Amino acid sequence: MIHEVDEVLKALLKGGALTDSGIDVAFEAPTRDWAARRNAPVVNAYLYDIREDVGRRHRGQVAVRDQDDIVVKRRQPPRWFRLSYLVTAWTKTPQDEHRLLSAVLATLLPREQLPPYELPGALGAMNLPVPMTVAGVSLAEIWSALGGELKPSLDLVVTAPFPAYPEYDAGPPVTEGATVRIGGVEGDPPMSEGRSHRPHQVAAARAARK
């Protein structure tokens, strides 16, 4: 679900407070070769690394039920992955670069998380918030790795809830109640059928289920 996070970032940057000019948002790596060809004020949103948010992981058999108010599937809670974006502003004049970076920071500040309504279909099917943290705390080594030159930058962290889908199937529902067989441990009295739940008890349980 990175092809939804990048689209959300592009829509937010284009549709944010930077409506004065039609700036271009690019995900290309800001290397020297890339920087030597651009001729328009642009915003680079290069993906840097992918890590799993081990602090927000949850383990447990989550029940999934149909319209009959009976559980039919067993799944696992989604695992959160942290995606880091290096955000930079490229413009001919350094003060223009500074004001572009300020505008980007101002348009990214108010969104602490992202409601599922804004998210696209694939990510919005989760119906879960998508945290988005700007800045919030090595950059020299990263910039050297891309081969570019150190510039002021924003570290945008997005927490994508990737799914774990083993999708275990539960057994058929128990409709005729439970039957209990009782007897002696050593087998001196033979085990009996022991009967089962009366229809009145089953009806009462099915009525109280609502």
Partner: protein
Amino acid sequence: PKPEDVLVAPNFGIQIDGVMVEYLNSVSNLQIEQDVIRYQQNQGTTGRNNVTLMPGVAKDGSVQVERGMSQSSVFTQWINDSMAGRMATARKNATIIVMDYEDNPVKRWNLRNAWCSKVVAGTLKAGDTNALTETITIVFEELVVE
């Protein structure tokens, strides 16, 4: 394969009767402990020393489960039921399951007459890059491994 050959991964889970809890972030240590009594004596004739340490009563404990804070208040309702003295419904039977790769229950710990004792909210700090954590200390009269 052999029971010792197959290892166990931390693919755990919980099940509390009456408390609707699906997932937990972590679970504290579960101890099966027994008291030990040491007695030192001297042989009457020869005088040699014999130290005999034996068996005590089984011990009750307090396994703790921590989760991610949310709108649900099942632990709040549990501790409210326990706080009002309605222990007929507050004392529940709990189960902690540790499964294999195929998520087939490998080990089960059953908590008998376990009711929630303490609920702690995680510290709230501005600018914290972490989710809020709720800690639940649940005491039990007996823990049986199965």
